[PDB]
Ligand binder design. Structure first.
Ligand SMILES: CC(=O)Nc1cccc(NC(N)=O)c1
Ligand SMILES: [Cl-]
Length: 115
């Protein structure tokens, strides 16, 4: 059902290596809806190539637009399984510290802070 369940560790590593070769300025991001989530819709895809200069605040705005949310729908994003300490960090810096061993950066979204 989840990305890590659909693709082998070998397959995920090789896909991150191809993104380094073909899209060297992009961060490879996996974005999934929390398995408990009732309110927010599912995304149209799972794997996102994010420009490495955007900060987490801008990436939250990007995901809100992709989900076509309105002003008063709540949205919380986990990175590497936990809350973001800051939304001001460039995603290139977030990637270096929070990347998975497969080389993806894993994010999960919910309408509650309580995941
Ligand atoms: C055994 C082997 O190929 N290793 C390796 C390690 C890091 C990066 C890459 N290539 C890449 N396109 O990111 C390949
Ligand atoms: Cl690129």
């Amino acid at each position: 059902k989840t990305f890590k369940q659909r693709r082998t560790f070998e397959q995920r590593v090789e896909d991150v290596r191809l993104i380094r070769e073909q899209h060297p300025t992009k961060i490879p991001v996996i974005i999934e809806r929390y398995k408990g989530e009732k309110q927010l819709p599912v995304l149209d895809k799972t794997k996102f190539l994010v420009p490495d200069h955007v900060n987490m605040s801008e990436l939250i705005k990007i995901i809100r637009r992709r989900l076509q949310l309105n002003a008063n729908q709540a949205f919380f994003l986990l990175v590497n399984g936990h809350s973001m300490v800051s939304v001001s960090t460039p995603i290139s810096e977030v990637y270096e510290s929070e990347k998975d061993e497969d080389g993806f950066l894993y994010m999960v979204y919910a309408s509650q802070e309580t995941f």
